[PDB]
Amino acid sequence: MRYRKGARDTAFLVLYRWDLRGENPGELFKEVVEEKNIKNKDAYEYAKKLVDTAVRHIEEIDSIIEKHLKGWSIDRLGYVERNALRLGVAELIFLKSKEPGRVFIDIVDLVKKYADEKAGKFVNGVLSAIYKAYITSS
Amino acid sequence: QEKIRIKLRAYDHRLLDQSVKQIIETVKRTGGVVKGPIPLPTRKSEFSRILDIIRFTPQTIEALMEISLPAGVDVEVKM
RNA sequence: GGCUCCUU
């Protein structure tokens, strides 16, 4: 369902701001909703669930990502890449997405939009490995 | 009072976002308040971000003047 | 809804 593309952008913006500012995610979410003038229950509620999921599982999400970074600490990643990966993991794994290909497409679109194609390849490459290890272990 | 809007640009987005981080930390450590950042779409390999400083003290300005941002990160302001 | 663009 296409409204989830917009919801992923909202959720990414919140995680990105949270990473940079360290303030209450609930308050950061309110800021983004007002700036983007989110007014539909579908996208507002899905964005809220993505953010709530990533925040509540943030330590495990970071560990899952690091397991596939070949020894690097997660602080090495750009702010765009690290938060796009956190969001991708939250949806694919913690919300057990039934449309994984669409998650990938929107996550990499975001990375390409706010960073570059080099960053998009890296995020796709890491997220794909994370996802295959998840599917395998399930 | 009156907000300061900063627009940052660069050709290295990791250094760009790290510079944003450093500005934010400096503002918060001196009792100021920020809004954003707003990442903007990359255009022709140039990355940009906008950050509003919505509350600041004279100490904020002093702290901000004493930081050195990486070469290659361009900063623009408006009130 | 174009259901991964594959480790900077």
Side-chain angles (χ1 to χ4, degrees), chain A residues 76-90:
Chain A
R76 289 266 172 186
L77 306 196
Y79 278 86
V80 168
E81 295 91 319
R82 168 173 54 256
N83 293 293
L85 280 166
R86 281 158 163 171
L87 178 59
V89 168

Side-chain angles (χ1 to χ4, degrees), chain A residues 52-117:
Chain A
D52 289 347
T53 297
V55 164
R56 161 180 103 248
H57 296 291
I58 193 61
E59 296 267 79
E60 186 173 1
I61 286 169
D62 283 3
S63 174
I64 287 163
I65 290 165
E66 276 188 345
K67 186 161 192 177
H68 299 271
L69 283 187
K70 295 158 167 175
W72 305 81
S73 48
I74 202 175
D75 56 26
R76 289 266 172 186
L77 306 196
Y79 278 86
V80 168
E81 295 91 319
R82 168 173 54 256
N83 293 293
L85 280 166
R86 281 158 163 171
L87 178 59
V89 168
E91 195 166 8
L92 287 172
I93 295 196
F94 288 88
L95 294 176
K96 305 184 189 196
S97 168
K98 294 308 174 84
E99 58 181 24
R102 281 170 181 162
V103 175
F104 270 92
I105 281 162
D106 288 341
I107 293 302
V108 174
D109 270 0
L110 283 159
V111 174
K112 281 165 48 172
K113 175 183 196 192
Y114 300 121
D116 55 23
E117 300 268 15

Side-chain angles (χ1 to χ4, degrees), chain A residues 16 21 23 81 113 115, chain B residues 13 17 28 35-36 42 49:
Chain A
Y16 170 83
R21 285 166 57 183
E23 295 169 31
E81 295 91 319
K113 175 183 196 192
Chain B
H13 77 269
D17 279 323
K28 288 168 83 49
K35 217 165 174 274
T42 299
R49 310 292 187 244

